[PDB]
Amino acid sequence: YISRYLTDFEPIQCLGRGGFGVVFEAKNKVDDCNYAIKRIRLPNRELAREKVMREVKALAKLEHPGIVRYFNAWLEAPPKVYLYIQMQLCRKENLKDWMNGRCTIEERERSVCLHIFLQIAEAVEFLHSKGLMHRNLKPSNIFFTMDDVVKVGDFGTKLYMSPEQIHGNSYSHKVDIFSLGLILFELLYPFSTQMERVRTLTDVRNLKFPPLFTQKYPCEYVMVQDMLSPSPMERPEAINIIENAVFEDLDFPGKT
Numbered sequence: 001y002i003s004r005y006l007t008d009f010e011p012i013q014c015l016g017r018g019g020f021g022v023v024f025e026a027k028n029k030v031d032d033c034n035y036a037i038k039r040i041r042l043p044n045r046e047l048a049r050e051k052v053m054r055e056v057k058a059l060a061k062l063e064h065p066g067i068v069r070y071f072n073a074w075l076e077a078p079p080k081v082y083l084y085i086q087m088q089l090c091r092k093e094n095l096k097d098w099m100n101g102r103c104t105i106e107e108r109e110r111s112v113c114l115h116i117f118l119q120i121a122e123a124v125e126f127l128h129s130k131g132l133m134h135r136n137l138k139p140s141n142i143f144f145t146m147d148d149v150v151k152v153g154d155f156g157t158k159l160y161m162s163p164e165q166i167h168g169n170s171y172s173h174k175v176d177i178f179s180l181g182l183i184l185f186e187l188l189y190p191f192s193t194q195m196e197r198v199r200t201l202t203d204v205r206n207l208k209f210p211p212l213f214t215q216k217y218p219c220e221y222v223m224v225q226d227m228l229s230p231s232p233m234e235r236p237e238a239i240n241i242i243e244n245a246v247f248e249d250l251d252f253p254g255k256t
């Protein structure tokens with residue numbers, strides 16, 4: 001049996017593993033570039049397989065500076081069945097890592113945080129304009145290119161999902177706005193411990209804010225409140241978030 005993956009690529013390292021499968025770094029022999037290759041074992045459930053095959057087709061249609069860049073997808077059935085997805089190789093550190101490495105307020109300068117957030121929001125508004133939604137927006141699903149442009153993806157815990165999703169109710173694109181609210185807060189508010197992070201984010205979910213955040217960031221405090229509305233209908237659209245005066249003339253020393 002001839003494996004397309006082993007024929008066309010030189011494996012470099014395993015980048016990570018999940019319930020779906022594995023992500024490798026591998027060099028394409030012909031074009032000499034390094035890629036991230038996600039390998040999915042096709043599920044035994046036929047409706048889950050339907051979802052996988054449909055989502056790869058959807059991914060292939062997507063082109064945006066804030067969405068991980070797609071190259072190829074193929075199936076292999078060795079002597080059960082694997083779907084390989086080839087995408088642009090990003091940096092090791094995702095947004096969760098980035099925040100974990102910047103644990104002081106000095107390391108979360110307003111304009112820097114707003115610049116990162118704006119890119120995420122622009123990626124989400126792109127999805128919403130295409131009649132798509134993310135559903136699983138969280139810092140660990142936010143990646144950086146080698147040039148630090150933020151890339152929204154989905155590697156595949158409940159702290160970022162909308163209340164309607166948690167309860168297993170029907171939902172709309174407004175679920176992504178809820179996740180955006182928590183991400184904006186988390187970018188602006190550094191933590192020293194996981195325990196502090198969990199306690200504070202849980203409070204913020206219920207619209208209980210740390211007093212120093214409300215004082216230092218009145219404008220983003222207002223927009224986080226709006227994005228975290230229990231009622232999905234009263235959450236703003238992503239296009240309304242991106243047009244907020246808060247994102248007007250963002251600049252910081254070292255910005256491209």
Ligand SMILES: COc1cc2nccc(Oc3ccc(NC(=O)c4c(-c5ccncc5)n(C)n(-c5ccccc5)c4=O)nc3)c2cc1OC
Nearest residue numbers: 015016036038052055056059088089090091092153154155
């Ligand atoms: C150095 O370290 C790393 C560099 C990495 N570089 C690049 C990518 C990396 O990981 C990723 C990131 C993203 C994805 N997939 C998606 O974003 C997918 C997307 C999607 C894209 C954009 N938005 C939402 C979802 N979907 C629709 N499909 C889909 C889902 C179900 C079935 C079929 C296809 C997706 O696979 N895969 C691997 C890395 C991980 C690294 O360390 C672990």
